Amino acid sequence: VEFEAKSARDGAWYDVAAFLSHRLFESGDPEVRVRFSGFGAEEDEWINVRKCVRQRSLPCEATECVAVLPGDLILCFQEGKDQALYYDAHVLDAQRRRHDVRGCRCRFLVRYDHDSSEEIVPLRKVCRRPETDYRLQI
Ligand SMILES: [Zn+2]
């Protein structure tokens, strides 16, 4: 019901407040005019519909870690030197650990798609693609 889009400024993903217009559909590769949440009109962007707009990646409740598998595309919270952004990343490996009452203890070796840098992150930094929800049924 809610959407995220990738900004050209940093290549990171942000919540979509509204879709205002679209163009280039006749090319088979349309773009949509996106207003991002909390950013006014001044920072609207023309964004590729097929590649850079999608249903929102949701944070994981402690039980959702089993739906995160090596090979998966995930949206990952990269706390950089002094900017913190959500970037596409792929799971290289998953260290399963028995949870506590604190929640999930699993850690994930991830590789960010844009710079191929790697990081071991907890579930808190992982947002799944809704595509993987079916894993929860299995
Ligand atoms: Zn876990």
UniProtKB/TrEMBL annotation:
* Entry annotated with the keyword DNA-binding: yes
Any one GO CC term of this protein is: nucleus
Task: Report the domain of life of the source organism.
Answer: Eukaryota
Q: Where in the cell is it found?
A: Nucleus
Question: Which annotated residues bind Zn(2+)?
Answer: 65, 99, 104, 106
One annotated GO molecular function: DNA binding
The secretion signal range is none
Keywords per UniProt:
DNA-binding, Homeobox, Metal-binding, Nucleus, Zinc
* Main localisation: nucleus
List the protein's name: HB transcription factor
| Source species | Zea mays
Q: Quote the range of the complete protein represented.
A: 134 to 271 of 380
